[PDB]
RNA sequence: CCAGGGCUACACACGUGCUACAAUGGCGCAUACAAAGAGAAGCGACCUCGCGAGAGCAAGCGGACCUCAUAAAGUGCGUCGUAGUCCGGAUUGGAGUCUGCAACUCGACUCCAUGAAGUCGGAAUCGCUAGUAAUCGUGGAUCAGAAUGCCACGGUGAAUAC
RNA sequence: UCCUCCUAAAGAGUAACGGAGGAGCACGAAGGUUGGCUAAUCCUGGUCGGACAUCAGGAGGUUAGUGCAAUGGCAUAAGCC
């Protein structure tokens, strides 16, 4: 429902995980780009998204491509 | 009885090559189909069971038998010998026409149809299925009826095991999703 | 069967949308015209459209297009 | 007049009466009669059987009541088992599109029981 | 100073508003009558494409000339014929367009589909005596995008005050 | 006042302010005859239906029932139609 021309990602997150695929499934990427859309070329990684005070580890599967990284990081807790 | 003639010629010889029987009648055969419809809500309105009698009389070819309460259980406020449901046991040539009108023109008329379960077996060869709506049979006019009448159909066969009974039932074109 | 306690059991003539006529005995009425029958129902093909409903990376390549 | 889903209406204009089927509203109903050559202002009972079947498959060209309910259910269930923010609002019956949950959102959350 | 999050969070209570519960009404076609304003790192005609939000191209105008901008209630015909119904639009699913580095938390708008509560509202309480109430439409400030709020403009236009 | 068990010592009978329960009705069918049928409780499957309604199959055997407190008895059924 936004950005018809090209899914969005940052240079700092795109250049990090493209460097991560040839090095195997190494350490989780500590990133702040909640706005970055997910591509099929990050599936399998445990990249951690900053929800505001911690970086929650999320396991990306195949289906989660249209969603962004900030979908899976609960910023506001409730009871 | 189209399926009974289909059974006596095609199905019986098909089942001889599945369990390598030595006698012709070691094969399973269907014994009865009991059209039970346990209304249950007739403790308050007695004529609901009277209207329930017309439903099984229209789906089948005979008037149903109004069942009586076997015990007096406080969980449902029923006493001894209270009319609570109705049943239709179809036997002879007449059940094959209902067996034809069920698997051919009534199974497609099941809403949100996906198929039948192959695990709905008692363990001897007696399949049992329960429909939620009566508008799968074209006898019901769907308008002058007031309460949605669902019912359950069990098919008692002479099979020794439920796997053997399913093999006999698989020759009668069942979905078995 | 007991006489005159069961309804009329007149044989009728039914037919689905595809024209598959069959003769059956029931309590419908004069005749019958159906919309679907077991020899034309999409149950051997309706189970094909229920399991092949998944997929997201193929849809994601319909937006990136490269 | 027993087309795809259930759809037995009577004494109603066709394009309005086709809205009863789950999966077709006002606009798609006008697309059914336009491809079937059916007059919009004429009731169903006046239409013959030879025109009922030519719109039975025309409705079948669009996803309808039978397989749409599970299609909607799996799209929601995909979000519910995902852990995303779209699923958590479906998990608690809360609005998913970011509405005024503080005072409003009675319809999504439910009737006020206390 | 910086990145992310919060200011939008939710068993709840209250205030102020918009839309409804319909037939003096809805829907479809045709059609008449305004005022006030705003415009350039903008208003953006005409034409083409797209069901549509909108996209391409793009004159004219820092302005009684050009654009926003076709005013709407109103009129004629057809239909619906009193039902939770063609009333009502929340909610949700899929697909999209614009803005902005970026629309997930939390923007607006559009297409299809789903279709809620609501059938005129208790005690109580509010505003109004005229071109006011009541109703309909329009414009502006804010503003990259983003109001049912605020300010302002006109159309139809009551009853009653012993 | 009457009925059932024990007390009560294997015929009968046998006391206590002994241990334990009921009755002072009911039924014109719950009687007679004929004919037919026989349960409870579990396991599995099956719309509502869920421990428990109703249905189908299997085990099981009278642990069921006998209008009523208990004893004795009952399928040749005294049990059910």
UniProtKB/TrEMBL annotation, chain B:
Its family remark reads:
Belongs to the universal ribosomal protein uL5 family.
Which terms does the UniProt entry file under GO BP?
Answer: translation
Q: What does the record note on quaternary structure?
A: Part of the 50S ribosomal subunit; part of the 5S rRNA/L5/L18/L25 subcomplex. Contacts the 5S rRNA and the P site tRNA. Forms a bridge to the 30S subunit in the 70S ribosome.
Database matches in SUPFAM superfamilies: RL5-like (SSF55282)
What is this protein's function per UniProt?
This is 1 of the proteins that bind and probably mediate the attachment of the 5S RNA into the large ribosomal subunit, where it forms part of the central protuberance. In the 70S ribosome it contacts protein S13 of the 30S subunit (bridge B1b), connecting the 2 subunits; this bridge is implicated in subunit movement. Contacts the P site tRNA; the 5S rRNA and some of its associated proteins might help stabilize positioning of ribosome-bound tRNAs.
Return the InterPro entries for the record: Ribosomal_uL5, Ribosomal_uL5_bac-type, Ribosomal_uL5_C, Ribosomal_uL5_CS, Ribosomal_uL5_dom_sf, Ribosomal_uL5_N
Where the record annotates domain Large ribosomal subunit protein uL5 C-terminal, the positions are 83-176
Q: Which GO terms describe its cellular component?
A: ribonucleoprotein complex; ribosome
Q: Which residues carry this modification: N6-acetyllysine?
A: 2
Signal peptide span: none
Q: Which domain of life is it from?
A: Bacteria
Q: Name one Pfam family in it.
A: Ribosomal_L5_C
The protein, known as: Large ribosomal subunit protein uL5
Taxonomy, top ranks, is: Bacteria, Pseudomonadati, Pseudomonadota, Gammaproteobacteria, Enterobacterales
**What keywords are annotated for this sequence in UniProt?**
Acetylation, Ribonucleoprotein, Ribosomal protein, RNA-binding, rRNA-binding, tRNA-binding
Q: Which GO terms describe its molecular function?
A: rRNA binding; structural constituent of ribosome; tRNA binding
HAMAP family reported in the protein's UniProt record: Ribosomal_uL5_B
In this protein, which residues make up the domain named Large ribosomal subunit protein uL5 N-terminal?
A: 23-79
